C-alpha cells in the first residue's frame, strides 16, 4: 500500500519462529531496537504488529524513534520508546515501470504534525494561503498528495523500497505469540530455576492459596518482585520463595594460641545446611 494508507496486520496465536527470518538474505536493512535478534526465540509477547508500506530510497533512514521529516511528521510517526525490528528491501523488479509507477502517493502539506501511530485518510485540498478553495484547486490550494516517479532507470538512492516494521508490546496480559520452546514437567518444593513465559528467576515453588485471582496472573510486593504466579499450562496459583541466604561468621581464638575455628551461619535453620541451634 501507499505511505498515507499504510497497512497494519494483527498477529496473535502463534508459535512464532524468527530463525527463518534471521537466516534469510533478501533484506538489506535488518535493525532491531531494544531486542537482540538472536534472542527472539525464547521471548513471549502479548501481541505483535506488522506494518507494511512502500517509500522512497532516501527515507529508509527516517524510520526510527525521534526522527524528523516530511514523511516522519506528516505520513508515519514512530514512538520514541519503540521496541522491535525494522525490515526493508528494494523492489525494482516489482514496483518499477518504464513509464513511471503512479500508484504510490504520499502527503505533502497538513495543518500540524500528527501524533505517533495514527492514520490520515482525508484528501481535502490544503489551504496554503487565504483564498477559500471551496473544493477547487488553484492558487493557495495545493493538493497534499504527490506521486513518486519510480522507474527502473532511476538512481540507487532514489529506488523504491518496501518497508515492513515489527513492533512488540509487553504488558500484564496472557502472551499468545510465543516461540518454539518445549514446556517441561513441573517440579515443586525444591530450589529450581523456573521460566514462566519469559519470567526468569530462581526459587522454590510451594503451593499456596493466596487468593481467588479470578482474572489476574502475577502477584507483586513492595519491590518489583513477583511473589505468586499463575501456571500457564494448568490453572493454579503457585508461590515464589527465594532460596536461603545468610552469612558465614568464623569464631576463632588467636592463631598464636591454637589453630581451630567454629563456623556460624546466622539466620539459617540448618536442618538442611556437633550441631547447635
Amino acid at each position, epitope marked *: 500500500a501507499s505511505v498515507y494508507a499504510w497497512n497494519r496486520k494483527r498477529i496473535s496465536n502463534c508459535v512464532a519462529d524468527y530463525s527463518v527470518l534471521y537466516n534469510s538474505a533478501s533484506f538489506s536493512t535488518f535493525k532491531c531496537y531494544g531486542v537482540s535478534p538472536t534472542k527472539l526465540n525464547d521471548l513471549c509477547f502479548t501481541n505483535v504488529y506488522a506494518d507494511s508500506f512502500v517509500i522512497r530510497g532516501d527515507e529508509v533512514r527516517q524510520i526510527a524513534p525521534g526522527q524528523t521529516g516530511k514523511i516522519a511528521d506528516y505520513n508515519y510517526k514512530l514512538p520514541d520508546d519503540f521496541t522491535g525490528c525494522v525490515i526493508a528491501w528494494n523492489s*525494482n*523488479n*516489482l514496483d*518499477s*515501470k*518504464v*513509464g513511471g*509507477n503512479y500508484n504510490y502517493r504520499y502527503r505533502l502539506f497538513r495543518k500540524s504534525n500528527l501524533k505517533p501511530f495514527e492514520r490520515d485518510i482525508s484528501t481535502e485540498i490544503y489551504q496554503a494561503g487565504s483564498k477559500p478553495c471551496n473544493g477547487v484547486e488553484g492558487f493557495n490550494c495545493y493538493f497534499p498528495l504527490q506521486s513518486y516517479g519510480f522507474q*527502473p*532507470t532511476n538512481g540507487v538512492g532514489y529506488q523504491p523500497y518496501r518497508v515492513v516494521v515489527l513492533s512488540f508490546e509487553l504488558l500484564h496480559a496472557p502472551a499468545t505469540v510465543c516461540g518454539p520452546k518445549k514446556s517441561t514437567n513441573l517440579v515443586k518444593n525444591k530450589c529450581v530455576n523456573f521460566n514462566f513465559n519469559g519470567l526468569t528467576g530462581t526459587g522454590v515453588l510451594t503451593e499456596s492459596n493466596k487468593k481467588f485471582l479470578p482474572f489476574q496472573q502475577f502477584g507483586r510486593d513492595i519491590a518489583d518482585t513477583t511473589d505468586a504466579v499463575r501456571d500457564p499450562q494448568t490453572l493454579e496459583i503457585l508461590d515464589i520463595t527465594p532460596c536461603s541466604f545468610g552469612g558465614v561468621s568464623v569464631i576463632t581464638p588467636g592463631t598464636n594460641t591454637s589453630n581451630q575455628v567454629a563456623v556460624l551461619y546466622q539466620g539459617v535453620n540448618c536442618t538442611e545446611v556437633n550441631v547447635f541451634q
Partner: antibody, heavy 123, light 108 residues
C-alpha cells in the same frame, strides 16, 4: 502445478483474423501479468504482447503494433489474443506465458509457460 | 532499439565437465538479465531471474554473474538432464523483453 492450455490454431488466408484463448487453473489469475510469445518454425523465441494484472497497461511488439489486441477475463481465469490482418510470416508457434510480477514492464520475467498452438497462414 | 547478442553457438561437454555460456548486451542493462532453459519438447522454464538470483525449484548447480554490458552463465556438471537451449532476455530497455538467440548444448 499450473496448467496453461491454448486454442485457436488452424489454417487461414493472408489478411484474415482468428481468435486465441488460454485457460489457467493452477494459480490465482487475478494478480499476475500475462504475455504471448512467438516461436518461428526455424528461428528463436520472440515476444509479442503483454497485459497487466488488470486491464490498465498494455504493450505490443513493434512488428505487431496495430494488428493485435490482447484481452483478459479475470472472472473465469482466461485471457485472449485477437490477431487481425495475418500475413505469411505469422505462421509460427504461440505460447501463453505467465509473468512473476504484476506489471507489463518489469525485470520480473516469465516463470511458467504452456504447450503452444500452431497456426498457419497459407492457401 | 537495443541489440542482444549470444557469443557461443554450439557447445559439447561430458557428464563431468564444466562449461560457461556468456551473453553480451550492446547497451548497459544494469544487471536486469534473465536466463531460460527451453527444452525443445515442452514448455520453457526459468533458471535465473536478475543477474545472479536463482529461482526456487531448480538445482543450485547453475550460477549466473555479470552486470552492465557483460554477462555469463555456467553449469558445474552438465548432468544427463541438462541438454537444452538457453536464452538470455533483457528487461530494462524501451523495446520490451528482447530475447537473444539460442545456444544448443549437446553433450558428447
Amino acid at each position: 502445478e499450473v496448467q496453461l492450455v491454448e486454442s485457436g490454431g488452424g489454417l487461414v488466408q493472408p489478411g484474415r483474423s482468428l481468435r486465441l484463448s488460454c485457460a489457467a487453473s493452477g494459480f490465482t489469475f487475478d494478480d499476475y501479468a500475462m504475455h504471448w510469445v512467438r516461436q518461428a518454425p526455424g528461428k528463436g523465441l520472440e515476444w509479442v504482447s503483454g497485459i497487466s494484472w488488470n486491464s490498465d497497461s498494455i504493450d505490443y511488439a513493434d512488428s505487431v503494433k496495430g494488428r493485435f489486441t490482447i484481452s483478459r477475463d479475470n472472472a473465469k481465469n482466461s485471457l485472449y489474443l485477437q490477431m487481425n490482418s495475418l500475413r505469411a510470416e505469422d505462421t509460427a508457434l504461440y505460447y501463453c506465458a505467465k509473468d512473476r510480477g504484476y506489471e507489463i514492464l518489469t525485470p520480473a520475467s516469465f516463470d511458467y509457460w504452456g504447450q503452444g498452438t500452431l497456426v498457419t497462414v497459407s492457401s | 532499439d537495443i541489440q542482444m547478442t549470444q557469443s557461443p553457438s554450439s557447445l559439447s561437454a561430458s557428464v563431468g565437465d564444466r562449461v560457461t555460456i556468456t551473453c553480451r548486451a550492446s547497451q548497459s542493462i544494469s544487471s536486469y538479465l534473465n536466463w531460460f532453459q527451453h527444452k525443445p519438447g515442452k514448455a520453457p522454464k526459468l533458471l535465473i531471474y536478475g543477474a545472479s538470483s536463482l529461482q526456487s525449484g531448480v538445482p543450485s548447480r547453475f550460477s549466473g554473474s555479470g552486470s552492465g554490458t557483460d554477462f555469463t552463465l555456467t553449469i558445474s556438471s552438465l548432468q544427463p538432464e541438462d541438454f537444452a537451449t538457453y536464452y538470455c532476455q533483457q528487461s530494462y530497455s524501451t523495446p520490451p523483453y528482447t530475447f537473444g538467440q539460442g545456444t544448443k548444448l549437446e553433450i558428447k
